[PDB]
Design a protein around this ligand. Structure first.
Ligand SMILES: Nc1ncnc2c1ncn2[C@@H]1O[C@H](COP(=O)(O)OP(=O)(O)O)[C@@H](O)[C@H]1O
Ligand SMILES: Nc1ncnc2c1ncn2[C@@H]1O[C@H](COP(=O)(O)OP(=O)(O)O)[C@@H](O)[C@H]1O
Ligand SMILES: Nc1ncnc2c1ncn2[C@@H]1O[C@H](COP(=O)(O)OP(=O)(O)O)[C@@H](O)[C@H]1O
Lengths: 743, 223, 131
């Protein structure tokens, strides 16, 4: 039959829209504006309006949450669709709210919720349904409890809405539309694709896995910093696929009494065994199952061995997925990694700059912002925040809009009128205030992301640019001809050259071009675990790079440890070998299937130990030279990305007076040149403001500042206070080393 | 607790609760004559005896005898009288007032024909049986019970009170009188015909009104 | 009314007067100060316990505690209606003897609350697992 289709979630809300492919309506004698009858399980009927969609397939119909909830269906089910454009106008409609949504609201709900909802929409409604209205500050749902004529009626401009009466008590067969779903998560697009793929099959059709006779998953382990939204992925998946989410907690198991903590676990798996396909979430796993060496007592060795014997006892029967959440995957007991136990592991990192914008638009959907808030600006300057912190920022900024309007609501009543709530607005003045007294909790944590540096951000050195392009893209984009021949693509690259010449910019740029993650380990960070702290740290950093394949790992100032060894004593020379030995031990273990690239930068190439340089490891030596003339003007242009329009600046004239400097020094020159220009503009406005002390508001033309009129003489005067940073001995040392390596 | 919770019970049911608890209390202490409430059927066949048409329909000398039996039948009533009022009976108390009289006059006429003395259990289980058939199709499983399938309650409960005690007459009559009333009040009108020729008088509605959805006032059409 | 004494602060009570009730004291008036003193009755809080005028050297910090706690404790219903999350834990830290259990005793005695102190040493040493 050409009626049964698969359903999926929408984007543009619109509680009375469904997306269908053009040919489907063409072959189903359907036309625009035709109301249709949708029928599903439990003999429930929902009336909607159809409209075309650009990218809708034939057999998939796109619809939002509210329409699905009325039909009592879930994702990926089948519905019955039939056109019935023979509805008769309703006369009087009785719409009443639900009890647990209007706590302390009162007021006239008709003229601030329903009035802007039905106005010029001609919404077709059916008896018994539920719809959700985004209020001024809340989200209030209603229930059409009576219609005339019954039950099909379309709301008309002449219809009497009887919105009076006590709220209806919430019944038992509803799914409580005000709960979590697949659209309440942002910044986790890839991870929520993996969890939904591994779980939707064992939980939606248990019968299929019995006939096929294959092994279903039995454990998923999500790790990441606290507050990043882990127990919301477990609550979203259980609410949409249909399951029996049964949470057991970390702290309250560990603190019941003596020996009866175990009887809490033993009878926790019992409900999940006799209550349909269930899902069990063990929060804070590291609180109850730490490493064997940190279990100093005995009753903490009884809980762990009681958790292991229950997981190994899950052999078929009902399908029960047990998921756990932990902060660090190193602190978990190693016995919880064998097969038949937690084996599939997912990583939930901190959000990136385009992720922090999506958390903002989710939490502020209920509020009514003013027309001056630039959510892009607030998103890009809050690095170091996790998902849970941006949910407090959007609340503190909401409290100002009532803190500064408290007089309007002076003591009010026990219930606050709804008219004043819809009159509120939140401006940038509040958001800048809630940002001040906020303490981000991520801060010191390695950030994995795709840097935004473009090729044009660096001038010259195009010969090196082609060289790096050959060793990265071609081995991964066109592998077939590499498949022929026993070719081994280079697994590493070493950069050596004069300091401040742009080594870190090259590694950032290539990662952006290939669109791969970037991880940077600094020098002083490399000596952090060099002393005292064991070499366990250098292990997980490679595992961190391993999971995020493809990525471009970067070691900055590799010769840091060698310089410490070189000295009066250098007693850490054997200790300096410790990190190198561990680095060497975990560099030959990389596989060709996973794409990981290692780049190390150094500035004393004659002091690096010969062990590192060897075939099979990072071995391509590249000498980065100082930029030359025409290239040395491109560095100057890298500071013209600001606005230093110095009249007839004549950059070519500025080019010929800037001979023989280094790379990073030139940018300092523009900053030094700009710094005095900022200062000089201060005296100009200080002169202007102290001159205005004589003339009271004598400003016929509106002008307050000279409007940044940056001058060239001001730029020229600063250049006079400039000295060459190029050292003749240093460049000569590298070139003879370059020739020695060349010959 | 005793104050508001008793008031929380509906007045119709709370009156039934008061009648069923006050009488045994007087009996256990023994102020009034316990033998004064016996409902002699043979005396009724000779003289009208207007003294006791109703008095013996609520008396029960609970104590050293069938003490446990009175507790349980009152217990399911307390646990299930409240439930059945909430089941399609909140808006129709006058109808729920009526059939209470119908079983009461039905059991007593059959009771007066034969020579039993205490018609206490019949008036509890008759309405309880009527509940089951009119509220079928749910699963119930208490802590000390089994996992028996739904719609088995009237039959499984029937054996329980029968085997504990005796008096085969009262258990059998109470179920069938509910059965025929179930067929008469509910099944008869659309089976062959014979519609509701027992309509409650307006005087009952005048005493206690029914429930109707109060429309109120419609604000305006808008636009 | 509270009278500042030589070394104490004695507070009296106008228990009877004439002509009732508004009678300004005049340079020719009769004062009856003799009799057994009245028992301290309930309801009202004493005028001798801590308040906002009993702390000094912490004018800035007592401004941060006050703005964060005045709203949830004075208007409990408004936070329910607006439905925003309130603060749920405040951690005062510093050297001992600087007046921390006095900042938390002035806030309860002024906004109106049910200050219920639990102590460290007494909880820790009750009995085995009964603590
Ligand atoms: N898309 C999202 N990603 C991460 N966190 C979110 C997201 N949306 C909301 N949150 C916030 O995350 C909080 C729940 O996460 P949480 O329970 O802290 O996980 P965990 O307990 O593992 O840290 C909620 O209070 C919610 O405000
Ligand atoms: N094409 C370029 N050539 C030389 N220097 C550049 C170029 N582009 C940017 N710079 C400047 O050089 C600096 C790069 O320093 P970096 O290479 O990180 O130091 P190091 O070489 O010690 O690691 C940046 O601050 C940047 O402003
Ligand atoms: N403004 C003030 N700042 C600090 N301490 C004060 C102040 N006013 C009084 N005190 C003294 O501090 C004592 C209370 O401090 P204390 O109970 O020791 O707090 P904590 O035990 O947290 O240090 C009071 O006995 C009082 O004498």
């Amino acid at each position: 039959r050409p009626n049964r289709l698969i359903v999926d979630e929408a984007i543009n809300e619109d509680n009375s829209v469904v997306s269908l492919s053009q040919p489907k309506m063409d072959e189903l004698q359907l036309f625009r504006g035709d109301t249709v009858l949708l029928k599903g399980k439990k003999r429930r009927e929902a009336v909607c309006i159809v409209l075309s969609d650009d990218t809708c397939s034939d057999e998939k119909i796109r619809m939002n949450r509210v329409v699905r909830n009325n039909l009592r269906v879930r994702l990926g089910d089948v519905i019955s669709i039939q056109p019935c454009p023979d509805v008769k106008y309703g006369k009087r409609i009785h719409v009443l709210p639900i009890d647990d949504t209007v706590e302390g609201i009162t007021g006239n709900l008709f003229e601030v919720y329903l009035k802007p909802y039905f106005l010029e929409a001609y919404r077709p409604i059916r008896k018994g349904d539920i719809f959700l209205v985004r209020g001024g500050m809340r989200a209030v749902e209603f229930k059409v409890v009576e219609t005339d004529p019954s039950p099909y009626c379309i709301v008309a401009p002449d219809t009497v809405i009887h919105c009076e009466g006590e709220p209806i008590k919430r019944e038992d067969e509803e799914e409580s539309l005000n709960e979590v779903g697949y659209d309440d998560i942002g910044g986790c697009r890839k991870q929520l694709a993996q969890i939904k793929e591994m779980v939707e099959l064992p939980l939606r059709h248990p019968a299929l896995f019995k006939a096929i006779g294959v092994k279903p998953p039995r454990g998923i382990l999500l790790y990441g910093p606290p507050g990043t939204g882990k127990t919301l992925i477990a609550r979203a998946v259980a609410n949409e696929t249909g399951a029996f989410f049964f949470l057991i907690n970390g702290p309250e198991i560990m603190s019941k009494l003596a020996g009866e903590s175990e009887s809490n676990l033993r009878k926790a798996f019992e409900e999940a065994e006799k209550n349909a396909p269930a899902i069990i979430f063990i929060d804070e796993l590291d609180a109850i199952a730490p490493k064997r060496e940190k279990t100093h007592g005995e009753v903490e060795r009884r809980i762990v061995s009681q958790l292991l014997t229950l997981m190994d006892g899950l052999k078929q029967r009902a399908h029960v997925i047990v998921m756990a959440a932990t902060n660090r995957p190193n602190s978990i007991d190693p016995a919880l990694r064998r097969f038949g136990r937690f084996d599939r592991e997912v990583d939930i990192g901190i959000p990136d700059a385009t992720g922090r914008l999506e958390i903002l638009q989710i939490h502020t959907k209920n509020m009514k912002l003013a027309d001056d808030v630039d959510l892009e600006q607030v998103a890009n300057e809050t690095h170091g925040h996790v998902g849970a912190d941006l949910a407090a920022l959007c609340s503190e900024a909401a409290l100002q809009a009532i803190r500064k309007k408290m007089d309007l609501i002076d003591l009010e009543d026990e219930t606050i009128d709804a008219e004043v709530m819809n009159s509120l607005a939140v401006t940038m003045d509040d958001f800048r205030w809630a940002l001040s007294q906020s303490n981000p909790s991520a801060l010191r944590e390695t950030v994995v992301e795709v840097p935004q540096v473009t090729w044009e951000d660096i001038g010259g050195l195009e010969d090196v640019k082609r060289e790096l392009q050959e060793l990265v893209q071609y081995p991964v984009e066109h592998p077939d001809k590499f498949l022929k021949f026993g070719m081994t693509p280079s697994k590493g690259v070493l950069f050596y050259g004069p300091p401040g010449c742009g080594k870190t910019l090259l590694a950032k740029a290539i990662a952006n071009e290939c669109q791969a993650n970037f991880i940077s380990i600094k020098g002083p960070e490399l000596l952090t675990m060099w002393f005292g702290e064991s070499e366990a740290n250098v292990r997980e950093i490679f595992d961190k790079a391993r999971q995020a394949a493809p990525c471009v790992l970067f070691f900055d100032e590799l010769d840091s440890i060698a310089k410490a060894r070189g000295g009066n004593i250098g007693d850490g020379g054997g200790a300096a070998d410790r990190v190198i030995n561990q680095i060497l031990t975990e560099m030959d273990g990389m596989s060709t299937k996973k794409n990981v690239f290692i780049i190390g930068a150094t500035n004393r190439p004659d002091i690096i130990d010969p062990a590192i340089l060897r075939p099979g490891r990072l071995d391509q030596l590249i000498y980065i030279p100082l930029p030359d003339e025409k290239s040395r003007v491109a560095i100057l242009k890298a500071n013209l990305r600001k606005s230093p329009v110095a009249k007839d600046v004549d950059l070519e004239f500025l080019a010929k007076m800037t001979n023989g400097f280094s790379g990073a020094d030139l940018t300092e020159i523009c900053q030094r040149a700009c710094k005095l220009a900022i200062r000089e503009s201060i005296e100009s406005e200080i002169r202007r403001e102290r001159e205005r002390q004589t003339n009271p508001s004598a400003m016929e033309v509106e002008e307050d500042d000279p409007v940044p009129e940056i001058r060239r003489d001001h730029f020229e005067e600063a250049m006079r206070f400039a000295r060459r940073s190029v050292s003749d001995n240093d460049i000569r040392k590298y070139e003879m080393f370059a020739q020695t390596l060349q010959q | 607790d005793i104050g508001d919770w008793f008031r929380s019970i509906p007045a119709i049911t709370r009156y039934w609760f008061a009648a069923t608890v006050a009488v045994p209390l007087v009996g256990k202490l023994g102020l009034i004559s316990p033998a004064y409430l016996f409902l002699w059927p043979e005396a009724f066949l000779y003289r009208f005896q207007i003294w006791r048409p109703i008095t013996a329909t609520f008396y029960f000398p609970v104590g050293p005898g069938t003490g446990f039996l009175y507790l349980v039948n009152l217990y399911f009533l307390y646990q299930y009288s409240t439930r059945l009022e909430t089941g399609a009976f909140d808006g129709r108390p006058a109808d729920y007032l009526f059939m209470l009289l119908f079983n009461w006059i039905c059991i007593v006429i059959t009771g007066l024909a034969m020579d039993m003395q205490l018609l206490m259990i019949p008036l509890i289980m008759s309405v309880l049986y009527v509940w089951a058939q009119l509220n079928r199709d749910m699963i119930v499983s208490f802590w000390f019970g089994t996992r028996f399938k739904a719609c088995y309650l009237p039959w499984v409960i029937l054996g329980f009170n029968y085997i504990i005690g005796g008096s085969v007459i009262n258990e059998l009559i109470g179920n069938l009188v509910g059965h025929l009333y179930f067929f008469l009040m509910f099944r008869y009108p659309m089976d062959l015909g014979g519609r509701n020729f027992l309509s409650t008088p307006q005087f009952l509605y005048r005493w206690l009104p029914s429930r109707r959805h109060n429309w109120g006032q419609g604000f305006r059409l808008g636009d």
